[PDB]
From a paper:
The entry of SARS-CoV and SARS-CoV-2, as well as many other bat CoVs, is mediated via engagement of the envelope spike glycoprotein (denoted “Spike” or S) with the human angiotensin-converting enzyme 2 (ACE2) cell surface protein. SARS-CoV-2 Spike is a type I membrane glycoprotein comprising an S1 and S2 domain that binds to ACE2 via the receptor-binding domain (RBD) contained within S1. SARS-CoV-2 neutralizing mAbs target multiple regions of Spike by blocking virus binding to ACE2 or subsequent fusion with the host cell membrane. Of the identified mAbs, one neutralizing mAb, designated Family G (FG)-10A3 or its therapeutically modified version STI-9167, had broad-spectrum neutralization activity against the early circulating SARS-CoV-2 VoCs, including Omicron (BA.1 and BA.2), in both pseudotyped and live virus infectivity assays.
To define the mAb epitope and the intermolecular interactions occurring at the antibody:antigen interface, we determined the structure of STI-9167 Fab (a therapeutically modified version of FG-10A3; see reference 14) in complex with SARS-CoV-2 Spike using single-particle cryo-EM. The global structure indicated that STI-9167 binds to Spike along its threefold axis and engages the RBD in the “up” configuration. We next performed local refinement of the STI-9167 Fab/RBD complex to resolve the amino acid side-chain contacts at the interface. The locally refined map, at 3.16 Å nominal resolution, indicated that the Fab contacts the disulfide-stabilized 470–490 loop with both its variable heavy and light chains. The buried interaction surface area of 610 Å2 is relatively small compared to other anti-RBD mAbs, such as bamlanivimab, which has an interaction surface area of 836 Å2. At the nexus of the interactions within the antibody:antigen interface is the RBD residue F486, which protrudes into a hydrophobic cleft formed by aromatic residues supplied predominantly by the HCDR2 and HCDR3 antibody loops. Indeed, the antibody residues W56, Y63, Y111, and Y113 wrap around F486, bolstering our findings with the rcVSV-S F486 point mutants. In addition, most polar contacts within this interface involve the Fab light chain, which forms hydrogen bonds with RBD Y473, N487, and Y489. Interestingly, the majority of polar contacts involve the main chain carbonyls supplied by the mAb LCDR3 Y92, I93, and T94 residues. In summary, the small binding interface and main-chain contacts likely contribute to the broadly reactive and potently neutralizing activity of mAb FG-10A3/STI-9167 against the tested SARS-CoV-2 VoCs.
Numbering used by the authors:
A (entry chain L): 1 to 106
B (entry chain A): 326 to 519
C (entry chain H): 2 to 123
The structure:
Amino acid sequence: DIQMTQSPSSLSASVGDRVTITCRASQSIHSFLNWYQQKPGKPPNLLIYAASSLQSGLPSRFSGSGSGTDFTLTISSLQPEDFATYYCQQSYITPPTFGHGTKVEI
Amino acid sequence: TNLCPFGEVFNATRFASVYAWNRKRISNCVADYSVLYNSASFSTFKCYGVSPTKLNDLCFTNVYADSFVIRGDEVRQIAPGQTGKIADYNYKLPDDFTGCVIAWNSNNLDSKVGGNYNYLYRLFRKSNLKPFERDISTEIYQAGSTPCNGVEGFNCYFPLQSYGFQPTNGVGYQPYRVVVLSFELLHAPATVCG
Amino acid sequence: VQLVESGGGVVQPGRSLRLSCAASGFTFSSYGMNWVRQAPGKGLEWVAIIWYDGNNKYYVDSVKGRFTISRDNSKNTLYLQMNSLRAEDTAVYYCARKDYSKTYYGYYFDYWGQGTLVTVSS
Ligand SMILES: *[C@@H]1O[C@H](CO)[C@@H](O[C@@H]2O[C@H](CO)[C@@H](O)[C@H](O)[C@H]2NC(C)=O)[C@H](O)[C@H]1NC(C)=O
């Protein structure tokens, strides 16, 4: 399968800052990366699918960008409800491997 | 004296898919690249190697018109030295290209409300296409290490995927018809002029 | 759309368990289903997938040969028969829905459950 490296493992940011989380794949996965958000002790929530498409109903501040091996999730305005762990998952080759996750601190 | 058949190439009612791009050779006719430039309807008209205003007198042995349909955001990939799912797997132009690329919007006549899925583009291939290569094979793509044995399953995908064309898509996703003219010289006499 | 899990608990090493996931709010026999586990203080780990046709099932390494993913489309339930459990399968297991995509290469987990804890150490 494809190994996923998510960087940074932990990020310190304040309200209204810019957040950028980079997911890198050992093998090209084209545009088949999805981004999930998980607050502590809660089920993960889908944020991005196809590496650029925002799941319907979620705040528009989130964005995605990437192709092939390097992908990026951008939070323009980090609101108090945006402090959670973000995972990147590849659907190009089953098994779908999740990145080890990036936690956003204060 | 015999106007080249550029009309039917640019007036075709049914364009080919990018993976089966249709190549029409043009020879033994006089081509006027004057209605083609000043048409005032072409979103993209970019000539590589030969200037658009000066090719109206350059005489060529053959002129290949390669027609297909792609998305708006993918027009930039029809150009020398471009990397992308269309440049790599569907239609590749040589780095030393000596022709022109024309493209125009087609939400009209090609964006049925229910969705026009007649157009397919290749998602996967074992290796990138060499310049001017046409791959119409529908063999299952083996992403994993397990041989597929010709059945669609996990890690075994159909290479061709249909373009999602809707009358509401953004300009980036709207259908663009593309015609690539390749003006070639050889030892044969120049049968294409204007 | 709700996916409620059950069947987790404390199980002795080497024994077996069966996790269940009841789904409501959507047609069951149109969506592929997934089991994804999260060990305490670790990231998500995909466990298994069952396709909407009831024939195509895929498993992750260290889970293959032990766990059996199945579905009873007539009861709107998704099962995971965890046999020969080890000490490394301590985790919260989520039943995740797979998008209405019909394609094997672009799927995402749109709707998750709540998670059931399966402790294995004796
Ligand atoms: C494709 O069809 C169009 C029909 O519109 C042709 O151009 C039209 O007719 C003449 C000459 O082309 C122009 O004066 C009109 O303005 C054109 N109409 C529009 C709407 O642009 C065109 O020539 C045909 N294709 C080619 C290669 O000639």
